[PDB]
Structure 1
Amino acid sequence: DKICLGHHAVSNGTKVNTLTERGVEVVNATETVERTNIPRICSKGKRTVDLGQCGLLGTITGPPQCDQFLEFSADLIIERREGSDVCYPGKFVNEEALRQILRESGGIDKEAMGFTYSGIRTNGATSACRRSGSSFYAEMKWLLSNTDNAAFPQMTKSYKNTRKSPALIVWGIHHSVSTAEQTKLYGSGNKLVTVGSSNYQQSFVPSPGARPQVNGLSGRIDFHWLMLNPNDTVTFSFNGAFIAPDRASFLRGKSMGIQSGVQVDANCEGDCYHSGGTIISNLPFQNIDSRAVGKCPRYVKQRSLLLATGMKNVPE
Structure 2
Amino acid sequence: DKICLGHHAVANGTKVNTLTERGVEVVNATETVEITGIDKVCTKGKKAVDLGSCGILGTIIGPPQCDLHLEFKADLIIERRNSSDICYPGRFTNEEALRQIIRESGGIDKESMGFRYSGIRTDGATSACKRTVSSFYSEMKWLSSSMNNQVFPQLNQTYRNTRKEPALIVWGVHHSSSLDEQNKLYGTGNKLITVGSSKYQQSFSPSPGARPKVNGQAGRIDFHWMLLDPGDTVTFTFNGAFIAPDRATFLRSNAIEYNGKSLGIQSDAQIDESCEGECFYSGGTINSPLPFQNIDSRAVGKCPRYVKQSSLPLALGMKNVPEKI
CA drift of 1:312 comes to 0.7
For 1:151 and 1:221, the matched residues in 2 are separated by 20
**Which residue of structure 2 lines up, in the alignment, with residue 60 of structure 1?**
60
TM normalised by structure 1 equals 0.99
Indicate the SS of the match to 1:102.
helix
Q: Deviations over 1:145-201 (max 9, x none)?
A: 011110100000010011110110000001111001101010011100000100101
Q: Which residue of 1 aligns with 2:216?
A: 216
Q: Which of 274, 287, 292 matches 2:294?
A: 287
The answer to whether 1:206 aligns with 2:213 is no
Partner of 2:251: 251
Q: Does 1:170 align with 2:177?
A: no
Aligned pairs for 1:60-139 within 5 A: 60-139=60-139
The letter for the 2-side match of 1:263 is Q
Which residue does 2:194 correspond to in 1? 194
| Structure 1 counterpart of 2:312, one-letter code | L
Whole-angstrom distance in 1 between the partners of 2:210 and 2:3: 97
Partner residue, 1:154: 154
Aligned to 1:222, the other structure's residue is in SS state strand
State the distance in 2 between where 1:264 and 1:213 align: 36
Q: Distance in 2 between matches of 1:205 and 1:108?
A: 30
Look up the SS of the partner of 1:173 in the other structure: strand
Deviation at 1:126, TM superposition (A): 0.3
One of 291, 298, 305 as aligned partner of 2:312: 305
Percent identical pairs in the alignment equals 77
Question: Alpha carbon RMSD of aligned pairs, Å?
Answer: 0.7
Mapped to 2, the partners of 1:196 and 1:285 lie a distance apart of 50
In 2, Cα distance between the equivalents of 1:109 and 1:19?
A: 56
In structure 1, what is the Cα distance between the partners aligned to 2:50 and 2:267?
10
User: Which residue does 2:4 correspond to in 1?
Assistant: 4
Amino acid paired to 2:32: T
| Cα separation, 2, equivalents of 1:211 and 1:276 | 37
In structure 2, how many angstroms separate the alpha carbons of the residues matched to 1:4 and 1:109?
Answer: 76
Runs of 4+ in 1 over 6 A off after TM superposition: none
The TM-score, its normalising length taken from structure 2, stands at 0.96
Q: Which amino acid aligns with 1:189?
A: G
Match for 2:228: what amino acid?
L
Unaligned runs of 5+ in 1: none
Q: Given residue 322 of structure 2, which amino acid in structure 1 is its aligned partner?
A: P
Matching residue of 2:271: 264
- What does 1:21-60 correspond to in 2, within 5 Å? 21-60=21-60
Tell me what 2:143 maps to. Answer: 143
Q: Secondary structure at the match of 2:163?
A: coil
Query: Alignment partner of 2:303: what SS?
Result: coil
**Letter of the 1:158 counterpart:** T
Q: Does residue 240 of structure 2 align to residue 233 of structure 1? A: no
CA–CA separation in structure 2 for the residues paired with 1:196 and 1:158: 9
Equivalence for 1:273: 280
In 2: Cα distance, 1:30 partner to 1:81 partner: 37
Q: State the AA in 1 paired with 2:299.
A: A
1:107: how far off?
Answer: 0.8
Once the two structures are superposed, residues 213-258 of structure 1 have per-residue CA deviations (whole angstroms, 9 ceiling, x without a partner) of 1101111111000110000000010000010000000000111100
Correspondence for 2:321: 314
Measured in 2, the distance between the counterparts of 1:77 and 1:278 equals: 14
Structure 2 alignment gaps of length 5 or more: 254-260
Q: Deviations over 1:64-117 (max 9, x none)?
A: 000110001111000001211000001000100000000001111100011111
Aligned length in residues: 316
What SS does the aligned partner of 1:98 have?
helix
Shift of 1:290: 0.7
